Write a protein that binds this ligand. Structure first.
Ligand SMILES: CN(C)[C@H]1CC[C@H](Nc2ncnc3sc4c(c23)CCC4)CC1
Length: 273
């Protein structure tokens, strides 16, 4: 299954949980807090949790779901809570879309591969009867080849009394307390809009504040998808951009039953390229 690490082992490999960023010679990737570690010539991501149910749920889902587009869990620590993963050198899709820390903008070609990869990851989760509940660009990680890897299965799983997730990405019924794989489809629709536009899902100093509202402006003919295409690309073609927008639009249907299933989303993204 997974390797059982003692807390002392993870303490040393992260250089005593060096809270300084990587750029200043520390071990912090970012925020629990994520630290870069080195174990048996292999680079690892150690998430020190700062909660026990989310630790147990992450281990349970990870043991059942192993896929090319899912982040891989290597081990854990519970003596004296840490989760050890395969390290993703290119961080999150949110960070790469915002060009955080001077990284070059992602090309349209890279963005298409990322969208396909993320859809393949969600498909595997849904085939294994799991609902993510927090699909967003911050939860889509990028490996050494910029392959998309869905992360954070702490909230993975019908009604609930504890509404959890990210408001800007959440489906109307998810905000109402419902738990359905169709809510993950809606959230992926927001991610597709972030990929096309390079804009975050929410920006308080922006008009409109929420990205999913651009779908209304396009449908009401107030604007077009061309007006919203990320200008930080030089290789975007109208056909494939409209094809990705069509998938995003279908995903963002307010009525959950009118949304396509992940298999259809996966099919439409493959046809796009
Ligand atoms: C704000 N940004 C700099 C963030 C900071 C956290 C970072 N997180 C990771 N970075 C590298 N590898 C991994 S594996 C794994 C995670 C992760 C989180 C869950 C499992 C993504 C970028």
């Amino acid at each position: 299954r997974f390797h059982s690490f003692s807390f002392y082992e993870l303490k040393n490999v992260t250089n005593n949980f060096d809270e300084r960023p990587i750029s200043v010679g520390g071990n912090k990737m970012g925020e629990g807090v994520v630290y870069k570690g080195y174990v048996n010539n292999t680079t690892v991501a150690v998430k020190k949790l700062a909660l026990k149910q989310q630790f147990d749920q992450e281990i349970k889902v990870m043991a059942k779901c192993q896929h090319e587009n899912l982040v891989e869990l290597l081990g854990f620590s519970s003596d004296g809570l840490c989760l050890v993963y395969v390290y993703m050198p290119n961080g999150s899709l949110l960070d790469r879309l915002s060009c955080l820390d001077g990284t070059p903008p992602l090309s349209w070609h890279m963005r298409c591969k990322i969208a396909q990869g993320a859809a393949n990851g969600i498909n595997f989760l849904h085939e294994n009867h799991h609902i993510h509940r927090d699909i967003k660009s911050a939860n889509i990680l990028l490996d050494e080849a910029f392959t998309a890897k869905i992360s954070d299965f702490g909230l993975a799983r019908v009604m609930t009394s504890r509404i959890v997730g990210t408001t800007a990405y959440m489906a109307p019924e998810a905000l109402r307390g419902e738990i359905t794989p169709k809510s993950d489809i809606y959230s992926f629709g927001v991610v597709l809009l972030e990929i096309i536009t390079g804009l975050p899902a929410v920006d308080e100093h922006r008009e409109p504040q929420l990205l999913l509202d651009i779908k209304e402006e396009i449908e009401d003919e107030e604007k077009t998808i061309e007006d919203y295409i990320d200008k930080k690309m030089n290789d975007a073609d109208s056909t494939s951009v409209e094809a990705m927008y069509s998938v995003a639009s279908q995903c963002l249907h307010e009525k959950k039953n009118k949304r396509p299933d992940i298999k259809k989303v996966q099919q439409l993204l493959q046809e796009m390229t």
